[PDB]
Write an enzyme that holds these catalytic residues in place. Structure first.
Site, PDB file in Angstrom:
ATOM      1  N   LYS B  45       0.906  -1.152   0.132  1.00  0.00           N
ATOM      2  CA  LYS B  45      -0.029  -0.160  -0.082  1.00  0.00           C
ATOM      3  C   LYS B  45       1.069   0.537   0.184  1.00  0.00           C
ATOM      4  N   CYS B 141     -12.527   2.378  16.844  1.00  0.00           N
ATOM      5  CA  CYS B 141     -11.012   2.134  17.184  1.00  0.00           C
ATOM      6  C   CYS B 141     -10.384   1.407  18.196  1.00  0.00           C
ATOM      7  N   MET B 142      -9.545   2.933  18.416  1.00  0.00           N
ATOM      8  CA  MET B 142      -9.317   2.929  19.874  1.00  0.00           C
ATOM      9  C   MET B 142      -9.676   3.357  21.093  1.00  0.00           C
ATOM     10  N   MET B 335      -7.064  -4.153  17.183  1.00  0.00           N
ATOM     11  CA  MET B 335      -8.579  -4.254  17.745  1.00  0.00           C
ATOM     12  C   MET B 335      -9.016  -5.603  17.933  1.00  0.00           C
ATOM     13  N   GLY B 372      -4.568   2.360  15.077  1.00  0.00           N
ATOM     14  CA  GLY B 372      -4.737   1.932  13.957  1.00  0.00           C
ATOM     15  C   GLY B 372      -4.779   3.066  12.647  1.00  0.00           C
ATOM     16  N   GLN B 373      -5.607   4.266  12.370  1.00  0.00           N
ATOM     17  CA  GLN B 373      -5.694   4.810  11.219  1.00  0.00           C
ATOM     18  C   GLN B 373      -4.002   5.507  11.917  1.00  0.00           C
TER      19      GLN B 373
HETATM   20  N1  MGD Z   1      -3.545  -3.464   5.195  1.00  0.00           N
HETATM   21  C1  MGD Z   1      -4.786  -2.801   6.096  1.00  0.00           C
HETATM   22  N2  MGD Z   1      -4.265  -2.956   7.378  1.00  0.00           N
HETATM   23  C2  MGD Z   1      -4.219  -2.116   8.027  1.00  0.00           C
HETATM   24  C3  MGD Z   1      -5.837  -1.488   7.971  1.00  0.00           C
HETATM   25  C4  MGD Z   1      -6.315  -1.362   6.722  1.00  0.00           C
HETATM   26  O1  MGD Z   1      -7.805  -0.493   6.596  1.00  0.00           O
HETATM   27  N3  MGD Z   1      -5.659  -2.172   5.889  1.00  0.00           N
HETATM   28  N4  MGD Z   1      -6.697  -0.728   9.308  1.00  0.00           N
HETATM   29  C5  MGD Z   1      -5.500   0.073  10.437  1.00  0.00           C
HETATM   30  C6  MGD Z   1      -6.157   0.209  11.751  1.00  0.00           C
HETATM   31  S1  MGD Z   1      -7.253   1.663  10.862  1.00  0.00           S
HETATM   32  C7  MGD Z   1      -6.081  -0.907  12.475  1.00  0.00           C
HETATM   33  S2  MGD Z   1      -7.611  -0.072  13.293  1.00  0.00           S
HETATM   34  C8  MGD Z   1      -5.582  -2.023  12.310  1.00  0.00           C
HETATM   35  C9  MGD Z   1      -6.613  -3.040  13.033  1.00  0.00           C
HETATM   36  O2  MGD Z   1      -5.672  -4.431  12.520  1.00  0.00           O
HETATM   37  P1  MGD Z   1      -5.738  -5.883  13.338  1.00  0.00           P
HETATM   38  O3  MGD Z   1      -6.693  -5.531  14.774  1.00  0.00           O
HETATM   39  O4  MGD Z   1      -4.812  -6.172  13.089  1.00  0.00           O
HETATM   40  O5  MGD Z   1      -7.099  -5.932  12.051  1.00  0.00           O
HETATM   41  P2  MGD Z   1      -8.007  -7.153  11.504  1.00  0.00           P
HETATM   42  O6  MGD Z   1      -7.947  -7.702  10.352  1.00  0.00           O
HETATM   43  O7  MGD Z   1      -8.790  -6.882  11.556  1.00  0.00           O
HETATM   44  O8  MGD Z   1      -7.351  -8.422  12.228  1.00  0.00           O
HETATM   45  C10 MGD Z   1      -8.910  -9.340  13.255  1.00  0.00           C
HETATM   46  C11 MGD Z   1      -7.657  -9.403  14.413  1.00  0.00           C
HETATM   47  O9  MGD Z   1      -9.053  -9.922  15.307  1.00  0.00           O
HETATM   48  C12 MGD Z   1      -8.240 -11.143  16.382  1.00  0.00           C
HETATM   49  N5  MGD Z   1      -9.851 -10.957  17.053  1.00  0.00           N
HETATM   50  C13 MGD Z   1     -11.096 -12.055  17.209  1.00  0.00           C
HETATM   51  N6  MGD Z   1     -10.959 -11.880  18.219  1.00  0.00           N
HETATM   52  C14 MGD Z   1     -10.661 -11.460  19.235  1.00  0.00           C
HETATM   53  C15 MGD Z   1     -11.234 -11.383  20.726  1.00  0.00           C
HETATM   54  O10 MGD Z   1     -11.698 -12.269  21.575  1.00  0.00           O
HETATM   55  N7  MGD Z   1      -9.707 -11.377  21.400  1.00  0.00           N
HETATM   56  C16 MGD Z   1      -8.712 -10.713  20.788  1.00  0.00           C
HETATM   57  N8  MGD Z   1      -7.258 -10.446  21.551  1.00  0.00           N
HETATM   58  N9  MGD Z   1      -8.343 -10.432  18.830  1.00  0.00           N
HETATM   59  C17 MGD Z   1      -9.507 -11.235  18.944  1.00  0.00           C
HETATM   60  C18 MGD Z   1      -8.095 -12.021  15.538  1.00  0.00           C
HETATM   61  O11 MGD Z   1      -7.227 -12.959  15.613  1.00  0.00           O
HETATM   62  C19 MGD Z   1      -7.566 -11.096  14.075  1.00  0.00           C
HETATM   63  O12 MGD Z   1      -5.972 -10.578  14.251  1.00  0.00           O
HETATM   64  O13 MGD Z   1      -5.226  -2.323  10.630  1.00  0.00           O
HETATM   65  C20 MGD Z   1      -4.497  -0.779  10.703  1.00  0.00           C
HETATM   66  N10 MGD Z   1      -4.280  -2.202   8.935  1.00  0.00           N
HETATM   67  N1  MGD Z   2     -17.090  -4.306  10.326  1.00  0.00           N
HETATM   68  C1  MGD Z   2     -16.416  -3.807  10.651  1.00  0.00           C
HETATM   69  N2  MGD Z   2     -16.335  -2.677  10.224  1.00  0.00           N
HETATM   70  C2  MGD Z   2     -15.136  -2.218  11.143  1.00  0.00           C
HETATM   71  C3  MGD Z   2     -13.933  -1.932  11.537  1.00  0.00           C
HETATM   72  C4  MGD Z   2     -13.940  -4.054  11.726  1.00  0.00           C
HETATM   73  O1  MGD Z   2     -13.006  -4.527  12.037  1.00  0.00           O
HETATM   74  N3  MGD Z   2     -14.787  -4.718  11.014  1.00  0.00           N
HETATM   75  N4  MGD Z   2     -12.826  -1.479  12.311  1.00  0.00           N
HETATM   76  C5  MGD Z   2     -13.568   0.222  12.855  1.00  0.00           C
HETATM   77  C6  MGD Z   2     -12.108   0.830  12.499  1.00  0.00           C
HETATM   78  S1  MGD Z   2     -10.931   0.016  13.429  1.00  0.00           S
HETATM   79  C7  MGD Z   2     -12.075   1.837  11.926  1.00  0.00           C
HETATM   80  S2  MGD Z   2     -10.187   2.893  12.001  1.00  0.00           S
HETATM   81  C8  MGD Z   2     -12.934   2.340  10.712  1.00  0.00           C
HETATM   82  C9  MGD Z   2     -12.236   2.322   9.400  1.00  0.00           C
HETATM   83  O2  MGD Z   2     -13.046   3.314   9.098  1.00  0.00           O
HETATM   84  P1  MGD Z   2     -13.516   4.606   7.957  1.00  0.00           P
HETATM   85  O3  MGD Z   2     -12.816   5.892   8.809  1.00  0.00           O
HETATM   86  O4  MGD Z   2     -15.451   4.201   7.591  1.00  0.00           O
HETATM   87  O5  MGD Z   2     -12.494   3.879   6.602  1.00  0.00           O
HETATM   88  P2  MGD Z   2     -12.214   4.457   5.160  1.00  0.00           P
HETATM   89  O6  MGD Z   2     -12.790   3.857   3.928  1.00  0.00           O
HETATM   90  O7  MGD Z   2     -10.787   4.352   5.463  1.00  0.00           O
HETATM   91  O8  MGD Z   2     -12.606   6.425   4.728  1.00  0.00           O
HETATM   92  C10 MGD Z   2     -11.953   7.293   5.116  1.00  0.00           C
HETATM   93  C11 MGD Z   2     -13.175   8.372   3.881  1.00  0.00           C
HETATM   94  O9  MGD Z   2     -11.821   9.017   3.531  1.00  0.00           O
HETATM   95  C12 MGD Z   2     -12.023   9.320   2.025  1.00  0.00           C
HETATM   96  N5  MGD Z   2     -11.200  10.103   1.997  1.00  0.00           N
HETATM   97  C13 MGD Z   2      -9.822  10.004   1.562  1.00  0.00           C
HETATM   98  N6  MGD Z   2      -9.339  11.084   1.800  1.00  0.00           N
HETATM   99  C14 MGD Z   2      -9.744  12.009   1.740  1.00  0.00           C
HETATM  100  C15 MGD Z   2      -9.046  13.207   2.303  1.00  0.00           C
HETATM  101  O10 MGD Z   2      -8.583  14.413   1.849  1.00  0.00           O
HETATM  102  N7  MGD Z   2     -10.557  14.600   3.008  1.00  0.00           N
HETATM  103  C16 MGD Z   2     -11.824  13.147   2.969  1.00  0.00           C
HETATM  104  N8  MGD Z   2     -13.011  14.195   3.439  1.00  0.00           N
HETATM  105  N9  MGD Z   2     -12.106  12.391   2.420  1.00  0.00           N
HETATM  106  C17 MGD Z   2     -11.027  11.769   2.433  1.00  0.00           C
HETATM  107  C18 MGD Z   2     -12.282   8.191   1.622  1.00  0.00           C
HETATM  108  O11 MGD Z   2     -13.137   7.776  -0.001  1.00  0.00           O
HETATM  109  C19 MGD Z   2     -12.559   7.658   2.356  1.00  0.00           C
HETATM  110  O12 MGD Z   2     -14.650   7.568   2.030  1.00  0.00           O
HETATM  111  O13 MGD Z   2     -13.458   0.863  10.524  1.00  0.00           O
HETATM  112  C20 MGD Z   2     -15.090   0.747  11.213  1.00  0.00           C
HETATM  113  N10 MGD Z   2     -15.757  -0.771  10.890  1.00  0.00           N
HETATM  114  S1  SF4 Z   3       2.549   2.735   7.553  1.00  0.00           S
HETATM  115 FE1  SF4 Z   3       1.853   1.349   7.168  1.00  0.00          FE
HETATM  116  S2  SF4 Z   3       0.800   1.323   5.514  1.00  0.00           S
HETATM  117 FE2  SF4 Z   3       2.251   2.571   5.172  1.00  0.00          FE
HETATM  118  S3  SF4 Z   3       4.143   1.994   3.854  1.00  0.00           S
HETATM  119 FE3  SF4 Z   3       4.442   1.168   6.739  1.00  0.00          FE
HETATM  120  S4  SF4 Z   3       3.207   0.007   6.943  1.00  0.00           S
HETATM  121 FE4  SF4 Z   3       2.698   0.224   5.289  1.00  0.00          FE
HETATM  122 MO    MO Z   4      -8.498   1.649  13.153  1.00  0.00          MO
END
Ligand code: MGD
Ligand code: MGD
Ligand code: SF4
Ligand code: MO
Ligand code: HEC
Ligand code: HEC
Lengths: 126, 789
Positions: B45, B141-142, B335, B372-373
């Site tokens: 990415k 998220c956090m 998460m 995460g973010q």
């Molecule tokens: N490629 C990519 N990387 C990202 C992001 C992305 O959009 N794309 N999002 C970023 C953001 S905003 C965030 S918040 C992070 C999220 O990073 P992670 O938390 O690593 O992301 P997920 O893939 O949602 O992984 C879900 C995790 O849930 C665990 N899990 C499920 N149930 C439980 C439970 O009951 N207890 C515990 N302890 N673990 C459980 C599973 O083992 C799994 O590893 O990723 C970041 N990294």
């Molecule tokens: N089922 C499920 N749902 C989840 C989660 C999960 O583990 N499972 N993870 C949760 C977590 S940890 C997180 S962090 C959230 C993330 O959820 P969102 O915050 O909804 O995630 P993104 O899709 O990245 O949304 C970013 C938006 O930014 C827009 N964008 C990009 N650049 C800009 C800019 O400069 N300005 C504006 N105004 N928009 C811009 C993109 O087109 C996109 O719509 O999702 C949550 N939802």
């Molecule tokens: S900040 Fe995260 S997504 Fe971006 S290059 Fe580093 S590990 Fe990959």
């Molecule tokens: Mo997140």
């Protein structure tokens, strides 16, 4: 390729999911636009394991030394450690390749990307 | 040809990238070898950041639902001038702001907003419209982690830093999937593990993924049972007599948590009625070292094993690592613990293991909460973009804080609101009901991100008594489901700043111009300000008290304070443009940064001088005298620790961190006879959240075109399903059709299924349950019961 996984038709309506696209196994390297643009994997990954005990990739992707000459299979930049020093073999950072190198499928981009190439700022084509 | 410094627009890791620019175009994206985070390395990415702002969709004109004919919710979408767009958007506001008032206007920001975008927002929502109804996506998220931070340490963000990766003696991953979600950090961890064979990695997870591929102690537990395991380890530390007395006695307190807390739903739902004690939740009540130990006693190795499903020998392996008083443990969690109906407890429980042993605030010994973010820390958390918060860990409740904010924002006393706003989940509900009638969504795609969309988020956005605005850079389902969509200048099309998971605050100049008429969210916020007047919006009493605040206009009062105007259109690096400074005569970012900066500086949170951040590749904060802080709360490492001290969690008055005695509890919804499968939800390496950006980068789309259901190879044979079969993931709330994929990266245990949510065609969040951790209010997306046909 279905309801713009980007826009979603009249949301939540009920959408049919197209069948899994097939990976591209035709072993042709693809061609990038800028240095440091991770090459895409032109072959299959499937059974290849990357773990604490083995790295299937490093079996084919390595460089020969001990005086012999063979064709290079990884760039030596994969030998530098944090700090840029060049180790005598691929460094552990870089061990999990799947993190940077991605294989590809036959999938039609849902929207064209107008990213342009460094020389001839023409929309990139690989 | 021209290389500029900039932080990755994704991940909370915070890798430094070097943006290649030619003819007003980004033509290359390389790894910044001068950045401490990554040091020349990115992930897929990252390297493809070059292709993110360039999908052919890029919104270029504001779009209202009916250009002329007026505007009708159930309309069309039409091009419309900015002025026009604001004209309509302002009117709707003013009205709502008179029929139901502030508790009816609401904003939903993101940890993807720039530091000054979340600041300008906080200001506008509170000092301006006088509403604390501002919450971020970071709530999903956090929240849990942040919430536990305050409770156990009295101050937010980690006390360690990435430097621990190289110092640790063994890593414990509590349900994290760094391999795919924090690659460069996983790279950093892998380099340590593989380079020094004495190091040991233990990864715990709900299913087997790319991360437990580096594990020496591979543990797969039952969804939600991590709580039990955590207590066992505490018990084991205590039973084997390996507590760090000198540390626990000198730097610790104990407490007990309220126990029949209740899965943050609507009062009406059974689980809450049954929840005797949901009215408090987060109740502390001090205790005794002796009582805690006895509570943790119930969780015998034999019992923990029974509840999790893990062979006891492995739990003995874990326990021990967290205990030989020489293994520098380094616990990491994302998460898994945060999107847990008992996430705050989980966070608490990890710190306990560390507090009990004294393994904290030292190089190598650290409980690191991964964020995460990109700026859920730098912005959402630090600027305080949550319903109940103000800058630098201050609450809207506390009057002294409110006052302090008022003094800095040059406002009339008693102006800022005391009421706690609607949190993310609530915000959807209050929208469904009709309590919030004006809504501004920014830098998020909540219609996809939020839980139970069909039940409460979709109807809430389409409720005709409601008006909804969505600023974004690409189409998006959320926008499709809104009434006014405003075009945004994205990433490097606007000067900005972010804050990574290790307290690293880094900037970036504007390197290119946004397409068409798009403008930064900063601009959008600031400009929309120019519409309200101190009359119109503020209470008359307050006005009476101060004439200069009559007419004015929220802008003169918020951004033309002579505080934010402080710096000229010069002071902006000769090279590099700034659209938000060409319009307006000041230099917004510098002004906002330095104002916002005054909240910290002194009381911990020290940010460096604005200009400094542009010359360097970030500095981890309390930056005191231009020197960053790696480890917090340690004499010598942290300057806020007085000479004769050692450690002092100075967030707390007594300077002691809390150890919470808490009981395992079960998830809101577990599998039944009708719904036999566990629905785990998450992400995939190639895609970022909604895929609005990555699904447009061709190599990433091609790499993983659409969402899929990961299932067990035998759980499929049995139902007569094969790989590729079109299945229906079903819940009491909704269905999806994803195709089955067994033999993919995630190797599921029998009875557990995983579907990533990046695909808008496949809205899994229709299937997901609305439950939260009742203390942090962070919804839980990792488990619920689902059926498949
Ligand atoms: N490629 C990519 N990387 C990202 C992001 C992305 O959009 N794309 N999002 C970023 C953001 S905003 C965030 S918040 C992070 C999220 O990073 P992670 O938390 O690593 O992301 P997920 O893939 O949602 O992984 C879900 C995790 O849930 C665990 N899990 C499920 N149930 C439980 C439970 O009951 N207890 C515990 N302890 N673990 C459980 C599973 O083992 C799994 O590893 O990723 C970041 N990294
Ligand atoms: N089922 C499920 N749902 C989840 C989660 C999960 O583990 N499972 N993870 C949760 C977590 S940890 C997180 S962090 C959230 C993330 O959820 P969102 O915050 O909804 O995630 P993104 O899709 O990245 O949304 C970013 C938006 O930014 C827009 N964008 C990009 N650049 C800009 C800019 O400069 N300005 C504006 N105004 N928009 C811009 C993109 O087109 C996109 O719509 O999702 C949550 N939802
Ligand atoms: S900040 Fe995260 S997504 Fe971006 S290059 Fe580093 S590990 Fe990959
Ligand atoms: Mo997140
Ligand atoms: C990011 C930290 C990477 C990891 C991990 C791996 N590779 Fe890589 N690789 C990376 C880049 C940025 C590039 C440069 C692309 C450009 O256009 O300049 C590459 C390139 C390769 C190549 C091509 C070499 C050539 O001389 O053309 C190969 C064959 C390659 N990489 C192999 C490889 C293997 C086997 C890996 C796992 C051990 C691996 N790479 C990991 C970035 C990263
Ligand atoms: C032996 C078969 C293997 C194994 C186990 C792996 N790769 Fe590949 N790979 C192989 C060949 C014969 C080629 C073409 C080589 C050439 O022209 O010289 C490749 C190519 C790649 C590339 C693209 C390289 C380029 O464009 O220059 C990549 C990115 C790649 N291989 C990656 C990769 C990874 C990550 C592997 C482990 C999962 C891996 N290969 C294993 C042959 C083989």
């Amino acid at each position: 390729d279905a309801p713009r996984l980007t826009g979603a038709d009249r949301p939540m309506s009920e959408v049919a999911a197209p069948p899994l696209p097939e990976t591209i196994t035709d072993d042709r390297r693809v061609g990038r636009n800028y240095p440091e643009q991770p090459p895409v994997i032109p072959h299959s990954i499937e059974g290849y394991q990357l773990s604490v005990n083995a790295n299937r990739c490093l079996e084919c992707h390595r460089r020969q030394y001990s005086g012999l000459v063979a064709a290079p299979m990884i760039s030596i930049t994969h030998f530098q450690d944090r700090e840029g020093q060049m180790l005598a073999d691929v460094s552990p950072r870089r061990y999990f390749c799947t993190a940077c190198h991605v294989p590809q499928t036959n999938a039609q981009p849902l929207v064209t990307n107008e990213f342009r190439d460094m020389l001839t700022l023409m929309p990139a084509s690989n | 040809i021209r290389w500029s410094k900039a932080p990755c627009r994704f991940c909370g890791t915070g890798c430094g990238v070097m943006v290649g620019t030619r003819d007003g175009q980004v033509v290359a994206t390389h790894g910044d070898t001068q950045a401490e985070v990554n040091r020349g390395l990115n992930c897929v990415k990252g390297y493809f950041l070059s292709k993110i702002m360039y999908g052919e969709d890029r919104l270029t004109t504001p779009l209202l639902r009916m250009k002329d004919g007026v505007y009708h919710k159930e309309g069309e979408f039409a091009p419309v001038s900015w002025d026009e767009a604001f004209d309509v958007m302002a009117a709707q506001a003013k009205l709502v702001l008179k029929e139901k008032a502030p508790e009816a206007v609401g904003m939903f920001g993101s940890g993807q907003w720039t530091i000054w975008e979340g600041y300008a927002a906080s200001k506008l929502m509170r000092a301006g419209f006088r509403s604390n109804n501002l919450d971020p996506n970071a709530r999903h998220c956090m929240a849990s982690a942040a919430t536990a931070f305050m409770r156990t340490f009295g101050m937010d963000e980690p006390m360690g830093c990435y430097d621990d990766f190289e110092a640790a003696d063994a890593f414990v991953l509590w349900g994290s999937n760094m391999a795919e979600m924090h690659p460069i950090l996983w790279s950093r961890l892998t380099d340590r593990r593989l380079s020094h064979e004495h190091v040991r990695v233990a990864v715990l997870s709900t299913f087997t993924h790319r991360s437990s591929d580096l594990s020496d102690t591979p543990i797969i537990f039952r969804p939600g049972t991590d709580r039990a395991i955590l207590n066992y380890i505490a018990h084991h530390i205590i039973s084997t007599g390996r507590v760090n007395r000198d540390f626990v006695d000198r730097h610790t307190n104990f407490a007990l948590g309220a126990t029949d807390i209740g899965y943050g739903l609507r009062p009406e739902h059974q689980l809450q009625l049954a929840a005797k004690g949901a009215a408090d939740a987060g109740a502390m009540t001090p205790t005794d070292f002796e009582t805690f130990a006895a509570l943790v006693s119930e969780y015998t190795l034999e019992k923990a094993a029974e509840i999790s499903g893990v062979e006891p020998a492995l739990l003995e392996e874990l326990a021990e690592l967290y205990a030989d008083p020489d293994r520098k443990w380094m616990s990491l969690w994302t998460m898994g613990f945060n999107q847990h109906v008992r996430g705050v407890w989980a966070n608490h429980m990890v710190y306990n293991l560390h507090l009990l042993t004294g393994k904290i605030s030292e190089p190598g010994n650290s409980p690191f909460s991964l964020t995460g973010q990109p700026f859920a820390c730098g912005t959402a958390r630090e600027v305080g973009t949550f319903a109940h918060r103000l800058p630098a860990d201050m609450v809207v409740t506390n009057p002294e804080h409110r006052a302090h904010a008022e003094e800095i924002w040059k406002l009339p006393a008693g102006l800022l609101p005391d009421w706690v706003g609607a949190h993310a989940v609530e915000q959807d509900r209050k929208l469904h009901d009709g309590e919030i009638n004006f809504y501004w969504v920014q830098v998020n795609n909540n219609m996809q991100a939020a839980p139970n969309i069909d039940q409460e988020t979709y109807p809430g956005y389409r409720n005709p008594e409601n008006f909804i605005v969505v600023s974004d850079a690409y189409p998006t389902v959320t926008g499709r489901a809104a009434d006014l969509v405003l075009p945004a200048a994205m990433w490097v099309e606007k000067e900005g700043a972010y804050g990574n998971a290790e307290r690293r605050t880094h900037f970036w100049h504007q390197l290119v111009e946004a397409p068409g008429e798009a403008r930064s969210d900063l601009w959008q916020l600031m400009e929309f300000s120019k519409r309200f007047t101190t009359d119109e919006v503020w209470p008359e009493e307050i006005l009476s008290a101060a004439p200069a605040y009559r007419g004015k206009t929220l802008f003169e009062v918020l951004f033309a304070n002579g505080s934010v105007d402080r710096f000229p259109a010069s002071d902006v690096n000769p090279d590099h443009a700034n659209h938000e400074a060409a319009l307006f005569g000041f230099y917004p970012q510098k002004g906002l940064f330095e104002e916002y900066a005054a909240f910290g500086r002194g009381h911990g949170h020290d940010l460096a001088p604005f200009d400094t951040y542009h010359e360097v590749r970030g500095l981890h904060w309390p930056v005191v005298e231009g020197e960053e802080t790696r480890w917090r709360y340690r004499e010598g490492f942290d300057p806020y620790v007085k000479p004769g001290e050692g450690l002092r969690f100075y967030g707390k008055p007594d300077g002691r961190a809390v150890i919470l005695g808490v009981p395992y509890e079960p998830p809101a919804e577990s599998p039944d006879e009708e719904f036999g499968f566990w629905l785990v939800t998450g992400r995939v390496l190639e895609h970022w959240h909604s895929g609005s950006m990555t699904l447009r980068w061709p190599e990433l789309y091609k790499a993983f075109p659409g969402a899929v259901c990961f299932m067990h190879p035998e759980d499929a044979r049995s139902r007569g399903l094969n790989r590729g079969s079109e299945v229906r993931v079903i819940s009491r709330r909704g269905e999806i059709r994803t195709r089955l994929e067994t033999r993919g990266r995630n190797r599921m245990p029998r009875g557990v299924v995983f579907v990533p949510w990046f695909d808008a065609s496949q809205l899994i969040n229709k299937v997901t349950l609305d439950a939260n951790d009742p203390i942090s209010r962070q919804t839980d997306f990792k488990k619920c019961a689902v059926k498949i046909e």
